[PDB]
Each structure stands twice: as structure tokens, then as C-alpha cells.
Design a protein around this ligand. Structure first.
Ligand SMILES: CCc1ccccc1-c1ccc(C[NH2+]CCc2nc3ccccc3[nH]2)cc1Cl
Ligand SMILES: CCc1ccccc1-c1ccc(C[NH2+]CCc2nc3ccccc3[nH]2)cc1Cl
Ligand SMILES: CCc1ccccc1-c1ccc(C[NH2+]CCc2nc3ccccc3[nH]2)cc1Cl
Length: 327
């Protein structure tokens, strides 16, 4: 059987919490008044939800309304509990209300308003300084939820809202989030395929907060190397092959040997052998302005097969990549 694994930080935070903190199934949903909101314009969507800019008529304030489709609606208690637990934390989206549409029986989550800057245009414009600044903002959100015994499990650009005018960031869409309990075996079918950590791709269920740190490295790699997504797999097996063509197979087999992981028996024909690529092969004239030895050293410390060997969110914040960021 596989060798067990525990987080190297915030391991015991949920054991010292009363059961009401993490036992989301026992939480009672206090439903607000849906007549308190007027839908103004669509901001965007997801496979799980329809997102709108709205007005809260009880205080004439702009709000964000997330209408949950049945897939997202199934896990509402867990999403609500996690949002309530993290409310007020650094760069965490603020849940303002929970409502239901009498006509369709569909629920919706109401959030604080975020004046979001263009998604497909933020990726193209952020300077070297901006990337460092915003990465540090994400790390504040990640260290916070991890410290509160929660794994986001869906870190990607679509789940990060940026108000570039006010240089404000929010870590959003906590629908896939989970409470970390040491020794617990989690479902690996979490997050987008592109941002999945190798622990998920190899069916290593006993994962932890470090999964978010892999996803954060995928984001950074994509940004500095101007390749979106950075690991573009066709399916879950191929996703690991894409990772292996950059990180090499040798470190991958050391990882599976360390935890005694069993791969599919056709593993040698699917994965084969691949050498570790040097980060310099991804550095060209058009992206060299985003690359520094500190960016590469930081990246290398996030994109590690061994989930126990990646920087934690707090250690990532001490990295020299962030020295030039005004604090
Ligand atoms: C149909 C949209 C919807 C979906 C899920 C939950 C609530 C509502 C809703 C229902 C009614 C109103 C009031 N409109 C004015 C506002 C809203 Cl936000
Ligand atoms: C390559 C990603 C990245 C790497 C390093 C630093 C920042 C970012 C980033 C982070 C976030 C965004 C903006 N993403 C917007 C996501 C979004 N907008 C929405 C609007 C409505 C509903 C959901 C929504 N999700 C853009 C970017 Cl470029
Ligand atoms: C049943 C335990 C077992 C005993 C002996 C040999 C293999 C397995 C096994 C163990 C796990 C799985 C499913 N997980 C496969 C993970 C995986 N992802 C890959 C991506 C690329 C290449 C191989 C890959 N294998 C399938 C299997 Cl068959």
C-alpha cells in the first residue's frame, strides 16, 4: 500500500476546532431575501455557475451574485461553511448573503463587489513588478486559508479576481475547497486538469495544502514564459506526461518510489523516459523581461513532484523574488 503523508504545517488546526467549524453537513442554511437584489449585467460564468453584477436595494450597494447550477448547488453547505470560516481573511472574497429563487429553486451566493479588470487582458499587460506584487497577494490568501485548515483545491487564473485600479486581489470560487484532516484520503478529481498536482494525477489521495502551491507554480510558469496553460494535457494521464516532458521522468519515479505509489501497469509505454528541461529553454526575447534568477529559483521550489518538498505559502512569502515588492 502507499506510504501515508501529513502536511508539514497547520497539521492539527482542525482537531483543536469544535466540530461545528469543519462539519459543514450539520450547518443550517440561513436564507436571505432574494427580492433584496436586482440583476444589472453578466460579469461572467463557469461550468458550475452564472455570475452577475447586482444592486442590494436595502442599501443601494453593488454586489456580486453567483447563481449555482445543480452540480455547484450539491456542495453549497461546504462552500458556505468555508466562506463563513474565511470571511474577513486577507484577499478572501466576502460572502454577504445566501438566497434562493422561489421559481426555479436554484440557490445563489451574494458577495462584496469586486471591480474586476479584463481577464484575457490582465495576462497580456502585467509587468514583472505587477506579477511579483499580485503573486504575493495570492500567497496572503493561501497562507490564510491553509492556516485556517482549508485547501482551496482549485487555484487558477479564473479563480483570482483583480481590481487593477485599486491594486486589490480576491481569491474566489471556494466550491471545490476542503477541510484538511491529517491521514484523510481525498477525492483526486479536483481542480482543472491543467493545474492539478502530480499527487492527483497518480491517485495519491492523502494530499494537503501543498496541492495549492503546485497550482500556484503552474500560474507563475504560464505568466513568465507566456504559455497558457503551461502544462496542457489532453486528459489526466497525458497531463502527467506533459509535466514529465519538462520536469523529467527521473524525479517522477523517485517520487512514486518514496510513497510506494502504484501507477497504471502500462506506465513505461505512456510515460517513457524524459530528461529534466532547463528553465532557460523557455526564455526568449519576448518574455526575458519577466524572467530573473529569483523568478526561476521560486518557480523551481513550487513545481516539485514531491508535495512535501514544495515551499509552503509562508515560506514562499520569504523568497527573494518578493524583495523588490513594497510591503
Ligand atoms: C432568478 C435569479 C435568482 C437565481 C438564484 C437565486 C436567486 C435569484 C433571484 C431571484 C429574484 C430576484 C429579484 N429580481 C428583481 C433576484 C435574484 Cl438574485
Ligand atoms: C496567468 C495568471 C496570473 C499569473 C500571475 C499573476 C497574476 C495572474 C492573473 C490572475 C488573475 C487574473 C484575472 N482573472 C479573472 C478571473 C475571473 N474573472 C471573472 C469574472 C466573472 C466571473 C468569474 C470570473 N473569474 C489575471 C491574471 Cl494575468
Ligand atoms: C489496484 C492497485 C494496483 C496494484 C498493482 C499494480 C497497479 C495497481 C493500480 C494502482 C492504481 C491505479 C489507478 N491509478 C493510476 C495512476 C496513473 N496515472 C498515470 C499517468 C501516466 C502514466 C501512468 C499512470 N498511472 C491502477 C492500478 Cl491497476
Amino acid at each position: 500500500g502507499p506510504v501515508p503523508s501529513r502536511a508539514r504545517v497547520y497539521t492539527d488546526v482542525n482537531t483543536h476546532r469544535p466540530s461545528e467549524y469543519w462539519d459543514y453537513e450539520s450547518h443550517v442554511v440561513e436564507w436571505g431575501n432574494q427580492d433584496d437584489y436586482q440583476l444589472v449585467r453578466k460579469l461572467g460564468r463557469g461550468k458550475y455557475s452564472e455570475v452577475f453584477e447586482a444592486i442590494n436595494i436595502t442599501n443601494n450597494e453593488k454586489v456580486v451574485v453567483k447563481i449555482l447550477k445543480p452540480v455547484a448547488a450539491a456542495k453549497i453547505k461546504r462552500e458556505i461553511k468555508i466562506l463563513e470560516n474565511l470571511r474577513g481573511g486577507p484577499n478572501i472574497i466576502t460572502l454577504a448573503d445566501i438566497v434562493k429563487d422561489p421559481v426555479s429553486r436554484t440557490p445563489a451566493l451574494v458577495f462584496e463587489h469586486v471591480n474586476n479588470t479584463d481577464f484575457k487582458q490582465l495576462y497580456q499587460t502585467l509587468t514583472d513588478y505587477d506579477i511579483r506584487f499580485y503573486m504575493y497577494e495570492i500567497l496572503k490568501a493561501l497562507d490564510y486559508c491553509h492556516s485556517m485548515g482549508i485547501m482551496h483545491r482549485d487555484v487558477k487564473p479564473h479563480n483570482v479576481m483583480i481590481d487593477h485600479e485599486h491594486r486589490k486581489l480576491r481569491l474566489i470560487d471556494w466550491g471545490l475547497a476542503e477541510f484538511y484532516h491529517p491521514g484523510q484520503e481525498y477525492n483526486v478529481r479536483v481542480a482543472s486538469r491543467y493545474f492539478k498536482g502530480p499527487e492527483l494525477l497518480v491517485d495519491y489521495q492523502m494530499y494537503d495544502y501543498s496541492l495549492d502551491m503546485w497550482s500556484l507554480g503552474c500560474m507563475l510558469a504560464s505568466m513568465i514564459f507566456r504559455k497558457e496553460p503551461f502544462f496542457h494535457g489532453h486528459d489526466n494521464y497525458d497531463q502527467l506526461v506533459r509535466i514529465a516532458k519538462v520536469l523529467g521522468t527521473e524525479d517522477l519515479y523517485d517520487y512514486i518510489d518514496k510513497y510506494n505509489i502504484e501507477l497504471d501497469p502500462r506506465f513505461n509505454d505512456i510515460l517513457g523516459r524524459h530528461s529534466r528541461k532547463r528553465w532557460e529553454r523557455f526564455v526568449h526575447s519576448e518574455n526575458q523581461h519577466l524572467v530573473s534568477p529569483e523568478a526561476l529559483d521560486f518557480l523551481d521550489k513550487l513545481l516539485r513532484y514531491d508535495h512535501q518538498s514544495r515551499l509552503t505559502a509562508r515560506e514562499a512569502m520569504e523568497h527573494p523574488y518578493f524583495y523588490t515588492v513594497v510591503k
